[PDB]
Structure 1
Amino acid sequence: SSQIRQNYSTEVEAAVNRLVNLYLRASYTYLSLGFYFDRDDVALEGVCHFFRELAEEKREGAERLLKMQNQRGGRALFQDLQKPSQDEWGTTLDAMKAAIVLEKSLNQALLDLHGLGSAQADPHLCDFLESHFLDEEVKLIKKMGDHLTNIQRLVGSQAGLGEYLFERLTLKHD
């Protein structure tokens, strides 16, 4: 048995490993989104940078989960990582809609794990998610919702113009 493990259920341990997989999948999705917007026939630098940043953030979230797994005396177990859902991501609007779908799925997984921890009377797990994940996710979903609204406002009858302007005047670029 583990020399450090205390109040750490096998159910939580397994769910943490699954969440790691979900975060690494999300990271991979964002890597694909980023490089799609770097295509010479797409060429929206700010959009590329937005999603490349998120790929790093999701990687870092998986790493924090893995650190916590070891701090509690659980055992990291890695599974195959499925490829992203699409090879080409459409417009900035299509991409941002796919991103918010993805983030809502991660948020629900966090809420589910928090509920398991609550049920198992695992306050360290619950605190961990509250401190490092739940508000980060709320903030990000709010940002994406703000972006969706602005993108939608800019479609008008001149979609190309709007998509350029959003990239130039809202998103961060060199």
Structure 2
Amino acid sequence: TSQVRQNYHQDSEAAINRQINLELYASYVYLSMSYYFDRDDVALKNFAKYFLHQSHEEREHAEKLMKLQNQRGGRIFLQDIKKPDCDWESGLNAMECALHLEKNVNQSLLELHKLATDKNDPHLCDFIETHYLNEQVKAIKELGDHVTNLRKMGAPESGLAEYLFDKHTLG
């Protein structure tokens, strides 16, 4: 029992542990997407850099939830990080799968907030709002914008489209 713990429910402590695992899974998916574009048979350098930066951001999102667990007096509990569920076939197909991943992560964060509201934990509500909810909203909007451009340009059939998008939008 922690000398610092106060107003922190056991169900919130477990939900934070489940959230950490998800953030580490998203980092793994973005790492797989990055090295697919570094292959000699795909070769889109800016797509690779974009997905590698997204992988590093998800690892920072996980480390800050681990900081929070200890700040409130909970105890961290880790599980296996699952292999990504997948072949990426093109620049367009990868951005669409990244859009569905960020919407999944956003649904979990909204569920975590409902729980923290039921347990009357206002410090935890503000933590989630401050550091996670507008970041997901901005990230999902950006991926939607990217998917729209690739399609209007002629992807996935026009191989010229993904090459020029690589230079102008990601470059």
TM-score where L is the length of structure 1: 0.95
Residue 40 of structure 1 corresponds to 40
Q: 153-162 or 44-53, which moves further after superposition?
A: 153-162
- What residue in structure 2 maps to residue 121 of structure 1? 120
2:134 partner amino acid: D
Structure 2 counterparts to residues 53-132 of structure 1, below 5 A: 53-86=53-86, 88-132=87-131
Distance 1:163 1:5, change over 3 A: same
Report the 3-state secondary structure (helix = DSSP H, G, I; strand = E; otherwise coil) of the residue aligned with 1:11. Answer: helix
Number of matched residues?
Answer: 171
Shift of 1:90: 1.1
User: Following superposition, which runs of at least 4 residues in structure 1 exceed 3 angstroms of deviation?
Assistant: none
Residue matched to 2:9? 9
Counterparts of 1:102 and 1:156, CA distance in 2: 21
Q: Write the distance in 2 (CA, Å) between the matches of 1:168 and 1:124.
A: 43
Counterpart of 1:90 in 2: which secondary structure? coil
Shift of 1:40: 1.1
| 1:156 Cα deviation from its structure 2 partner | 6.2
Q: Measured at CA, do residues 156 and 11 of structure 1 come closer, stay the same or move farther in structure 2, by a change above 3 Å? A: closer
Aligned residue identity for 1:19: Q
Q: Contact 2:92–2:156 at 8 Å: present in 1 too?
A: no
TM-aligned CA deviation for residue 159 of structure 1: 1.2
Deviation at 1:66, TM superposition (A): 0.4
Between the aligned residues of both structures, percent identity stands at 53
Counterpart residue identity of residue 113, structure 1:
L
Q: What do you get for the CA RMSD once the two structures are aligned?
A: 1.1
Contact 2:33 2:48 in 1 (8 A): yes
- One-letter amino acid of the counterpart of residue 108, structure 1: Q
Conservation of the 8 A alpha-carbon contact between 2:26 and 2:58: yes
CA contact (8 A) 2:155 2:162 kept: no
> Structure 2 vs 1, CA of residues 157 and 127 (structure 1 numbering), >3 Å: closer, same or farther?
closer
Distance 1:115 1:66, change over 3 A: same
Q: Any gaps of 5 or more consecutive residues in structure 2?
A: none
How far did 1:158 drift?
A: 5.4
Q: CA deviation at 1:170?
A: 0.5
